[PDB]
Amino acid sequence: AKLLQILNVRVVGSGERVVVLSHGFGTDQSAWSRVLPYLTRDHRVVLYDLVCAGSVNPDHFDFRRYDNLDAYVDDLLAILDALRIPRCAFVGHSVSAMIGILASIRRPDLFAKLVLIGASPRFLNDSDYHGGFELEEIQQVFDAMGANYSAWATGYAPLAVGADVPAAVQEFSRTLFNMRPDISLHVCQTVFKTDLRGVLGMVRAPCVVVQTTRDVSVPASVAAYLKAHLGGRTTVEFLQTEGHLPHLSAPSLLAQVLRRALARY
Numbered sequence: 001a002k003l004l005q006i007l008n009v010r011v012v013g014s015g016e017r018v019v020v021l022s023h024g025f026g027t028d029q030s031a032w033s034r035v036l037p038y039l040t041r042d043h044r045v046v047l048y049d050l051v052c053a054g055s056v057n058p059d060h061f062d063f064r065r066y067d068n069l070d071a072y073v074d075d076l077l078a079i080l081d082a083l084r085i086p087r088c089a090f091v092g093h094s095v096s097a098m099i100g101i102l103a104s105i106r107r108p109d110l111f112a113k114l115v116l117i118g119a120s121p122r123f124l125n126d127s128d129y130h131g132g133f134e135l136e137e138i139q140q141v142f143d144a145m146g147a148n149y150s151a152w153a154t155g156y157a158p159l160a161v162g163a164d165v166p167a168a169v170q171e172f173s174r175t176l177f178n179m180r181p182d183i184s185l186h187v188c189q190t191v192f193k194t195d196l197r198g199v200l201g202m203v204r205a206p207c208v209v210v211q212t213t214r215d216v217s218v219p220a221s222v223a224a225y226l227k228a229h230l231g232g233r234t235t236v237e238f239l240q241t242e243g244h245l246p247h248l249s250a251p252s253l254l255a256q257v258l259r260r261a262l263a264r265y
């Protein structure tokens, strides 16, 4: 209930069908602004900010409770329950893909379908598992973030966007810089520690994994891994575009996949 204001919950559009948009690391809900109008004619759309977003009062960030993604799940479920929404489709980017997976296990009847964008169950490499990162690489990210956040963010923004799209780089950089540096590092650490591989099979909801041609945080092989192990019906949809944030950088292309995924559930 109090979360509705704290996490800046917005509900827009019209319809039978409820769709939740949950943003990823380094953005707030405004990252959905370019795809949103492709949805609001036929869908009731719920948007909110993760507690770590810069647009949320930093005094509300609990460094203890949110050192596990379960707490982010608690927030999402609390919002949906407050809104008295019994069933929805869920679209999650980055960390929100993990949140969505976990939420669908916690409350199977609540989530009719999952759309996962820039999605991975584990970033650290394991035997025969290519997550894209070794421990030492992960630690260097943390060190970089701690020592010089502005420089790390300046470097990270173009890499994450990937494609040559100035407005997307500018918009991602703005929200990344809007985060408080210590909160940004904390969430980064929390996500890198997370390993959802062992619970993928517990997901029952049908799922669409969105894959782009190149993702700096997600190897091309992860989508196939997710399709293989997610416990429901999973389809991989392919965007002929480059980057980690297609909702920012290629909203038209992504819109068509979203409208395709959200037509039936």
Ligand SMILES: C/C(=C/[C@@H](O)Cc1ccc(Br)cc1)C(=O)O
Binding pocket: 025, 094, 095, 141, 156, 187, 188, 189, 191, 192, 216, 217
């Ligand atoms: C929280 C989070 C952290 C990392 O993935 C961000 C990242 C990824 C790759 C590189 Br290089 C530098 C930073 C996420 O993307 O979900």
